[PDB]
Design a protein around this nucleic acid. Sequence first.
RNA 1: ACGAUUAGC
RNA 2: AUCGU
Lengths: 1255, 40, 14
Amino acid sequence: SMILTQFGPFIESISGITDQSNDVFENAAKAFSMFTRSDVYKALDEIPFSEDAMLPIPPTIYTKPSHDSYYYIDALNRVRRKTYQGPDDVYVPNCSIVELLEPHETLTSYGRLSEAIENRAKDGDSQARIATTYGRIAESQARQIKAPLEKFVLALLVAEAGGSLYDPVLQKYDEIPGLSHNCPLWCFREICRHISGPLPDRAPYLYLSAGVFWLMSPRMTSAIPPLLSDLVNLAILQQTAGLDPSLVRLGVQICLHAAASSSYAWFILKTKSIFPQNTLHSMYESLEGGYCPNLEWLEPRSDYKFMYMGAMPLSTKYARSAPSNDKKARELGEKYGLSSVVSELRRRTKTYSKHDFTSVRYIRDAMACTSGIFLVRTPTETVLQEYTQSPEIKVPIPQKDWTGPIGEIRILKDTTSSIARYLYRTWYLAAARMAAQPRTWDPLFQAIMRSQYVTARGGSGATLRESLYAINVSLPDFKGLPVKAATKIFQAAQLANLPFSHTSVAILADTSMGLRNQVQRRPRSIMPLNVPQQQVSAPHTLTADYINYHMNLSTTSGSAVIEKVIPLGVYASSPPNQSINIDISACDASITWDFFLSVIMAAIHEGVASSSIGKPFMGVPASIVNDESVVGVRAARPISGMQNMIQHLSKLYKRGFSYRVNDSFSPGNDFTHMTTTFPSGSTATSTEHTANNSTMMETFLTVWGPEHTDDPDVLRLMKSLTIQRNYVCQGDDGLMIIDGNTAGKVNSETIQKMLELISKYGEEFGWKYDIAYDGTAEYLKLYFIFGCRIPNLSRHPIVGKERANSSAEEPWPAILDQIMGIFFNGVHDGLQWQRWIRYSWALCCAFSRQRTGYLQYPMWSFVYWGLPLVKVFGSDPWIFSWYMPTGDLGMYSWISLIRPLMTRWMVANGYVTDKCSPVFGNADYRKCFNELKLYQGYYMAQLPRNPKKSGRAAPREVREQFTQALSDYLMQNPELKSRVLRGRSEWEKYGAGIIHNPPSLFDVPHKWYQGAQEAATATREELAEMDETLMRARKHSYSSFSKLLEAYLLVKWRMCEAREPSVDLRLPLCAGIDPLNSDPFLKMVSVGPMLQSTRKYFAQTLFMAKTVSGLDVNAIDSALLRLRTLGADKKALTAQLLMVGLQESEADALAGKIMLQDVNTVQLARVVNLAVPDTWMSLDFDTMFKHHVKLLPKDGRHLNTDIPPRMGWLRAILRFLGAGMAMTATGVAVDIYLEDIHGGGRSLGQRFMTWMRQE
Amino acid sequence: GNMTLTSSEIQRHITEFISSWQNHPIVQVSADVENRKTAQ
Amino acid sequence: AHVASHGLNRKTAQ
RNA sequence: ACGAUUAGC
RNA sequence: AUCGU
């Protein structure tokens, strides 16, 4: 009840009870700021739990052994963990830690790692080294959380104190059990109580910036810090998603069993496919009904043209024909003592026989119940376990099938009986078609591809300088300036004047290490190659790009669920056309010099021979190299620059790679390691992986398959499908589509035999295909069943964050950004919208205050950041959806939605002004907004959230020689420099400063210098300046909004009739969205999902496909469109395009094209800084932008909404102005008609032009 | 003229939308499970 | 209105 | 004499 | 990765 007493107004504010104001928000934020952890645990103890919330806790979590019997010292004086269960028992042991703690000062009941053991390990003791390695590794495991966990627990308590929430659409309260039924939260309380014991302190551990402190007690172990985060994640997911209690109890049982085992991370890795394999892989054993989408994707295939044609009922014969997954599931449940959970899951799964919403929600809950944490282990062990495996080639290429060496490459004669002939042919044709194809010789293309890898990020520069100084060649050093000295930009500046002959030695340097953790998967090591080593591998990635662009059917999709090929999964998961999931295990170590690289280098080498003689490639001169090709005689065979590139890359690939490992968690554990695995983190990795996958699948389907099969039906199936029609590969993973015939779906036995054939075929050249045939589809970690997406909640943890090194965390605005990212991730995953909004506001308030004086962010800043608001100004609660556009458009949308009530509310209490405003009328909006801090929050939200360590003082002439070095590196070909100088000349002649900052190639070194300086630690003065900036912004008073927002508010709209449905209301398209989730369900049904990949659709809008790194294509196109709208001569556009580096004829033609053509709304929108929000990109927004937003009013022309024939670009801005309002409001998306513009179309266009003449 | 956003205002659009969906000829006769005689 | 939404001379006289 | 070192997209 | 110790 203390939560109620200390937070009364805040719950009523954020639960739709009363109005949502700023003073209550700030008081609640202050109370969050001053709230001790022990008080949090007391309030936790005040919870009156019930039964159904209690699950027995084994007594063996607390009583654990020590760490000495788990580690040892091998030869070469290295520290590593001995294994007890196979070769994967190399994770953190669950042993006790108490005997390694010395009490910290200023508080007795907490301690950290003792400095005595640290010193005794530093000077060379063995047991001390083991103890400190264990302590540091446990510290790293415990340090995998965004913020102190008590903040999240208290925010959940505050949010859930409100109880059930009313639903405006469903017209009833939501039936979700309260906190008294929260099993994980009760487990958290019990564990904390048992660990704390008689000691007054109750927190098992406290998480600081750098390092954490352990509360010493005999019951404390190393498995507690991940367990607590796991339970809190489960509790938050239960509260914000309506998870049923049984599945959450099963998940908590699994988590406790994992904690009680020998190793938490190892056990949770061994049991990571319990829920997905018992539930997702076993439903619909017997069907009687349901609806599935009747997708059909057109014969143009590389463009991914998908069409949706209604929904068809499910027949009984569309049951689960895949082989049963019972034996291995039962065996796994019996092995690890989880038989009860597996039996419960299997019994519960069989009770769902109809493809309604409930089964999909049950699947979503089951997949969400898995444990999502970032697994961690010592780098010297992941290096020793990942980079020592080698491929197993059972039928290698015969020795007689090669020829004499062309330098270090032997061409493979086409008379071979091996399967590598087809791979060699495909790569040879790809290389030839590249070399003949002419865009690879324009200097701009070479400059772009040379600047691809030049990035403000580490690239192992120390090894580069050591290797290059090993030949007594000296490179310049820069001292006194604040740029980072361990980045690839520094290497590029150092390698400016040097020719290729001197820098060719550094190609064989030893790469440094890298590491990053991942959810429910072993951490991946990454080797960044130095700048010349990126350079030397350009033809490989280029011909791989050609293969992946023309020869095969594949995609190179983006990171988020919005930018992905969702339609393909929906099509491949429909019942008539079942699909097969093909995955390659450990593809990094797969390809080596024995088979794959050996074929590929020769194919590339003689692919380019007869197309490019001379004409040196980027920074690599052509050279001479002999060959013993034919019988005995040897020639000199002059080669091009690309072939010298290939020779150097071939020696690098033939010898192997040297991998320096100098970790920090284990002292005295530095060494080197030679490995044969293909490097990860290189430019060419994913492209060649996908190309090889496609080529090998194609050759299997063509030649190898029929040569090793007997049955007629399987042969008929294999002759029917090809990779150009049904096979989509991206990197390691892949997906194959089997389409349905006239007689239903293809027989399962033929598919099983074909999969056995694939498994046999893959082992010939050292591949182990991980093939799953379960009736569902998996691709890029997306799960589909019967044409319905399923978001994996556990893969996106709420409190988790991966950290490899022991670096301290970023300041408070960074955690603000992280909370906003958490909210957006919750949006994409489809949670319970009301509860999720309330909890997001709770976290918002919790993390909104920080001392230095105190600094606070007024709620309105967070609203500007995109978080929707519940109930303000006395309006109806739960009135705005989260499809609100972020940014200015978003403010306009909600303000224009609620304006006629805002004015009434303002006037009703002491805000009256005689002056009349066209937007707000006679209400003193200025004083009200200044008092409400709305201006203050709106302006403060725009300030940068990172210290302005860029621009720090630097001694002169040193920055000058630095910038000169980058300028020389960027532009080695004189003709491109001539183009840039011309572009500047006609820009001075014609541009005349119409646009303030036109992008150009000369400013790339400045941007690179700023970026390289940015990646550095910020001094205390930079943080002080940041806090002073925030304080000054808060204290200041603002007269009015930004120009864009004031211009937007001049537009009025009207909403008459709702759209007709675009999707059947009985068709489950995605999990989590259903009648229980009113807003997303209605939004998707009224608008419709996007049935086209967003990547290509967004790509077709850009004028220029790609530009040099350090410049933005959006910036270039925005400058071009500003120079069109603000009247300017064509010559100005020609000068701008020349400054970008385009050739004079092409620049002239493109400027002439741009002058007169019209372009779709997206590009025109960019002119005023507007883009489609990342939230909308999961829906079919294009049709709404085209048709369902009409600029002509419903009652004809009003003579006031008269857009002139000039400035016709206003239509796109009006389209987003209407669409933001159409999408912000809850319920059905409604057709929206333009009503009135106050100042007139020409006046509003003049306002936009006078803003364009800025920036 | 000055139309705000209201719960009843959302409800009327919801009713119009659902009526428009229900008045679809295919939806009017579509069924997910067969009756006792269509199976025969 | 919200609750409704929830629920959903002498001579002349002579 | 030791020390806040990293991919690609 | 030397002035932090």
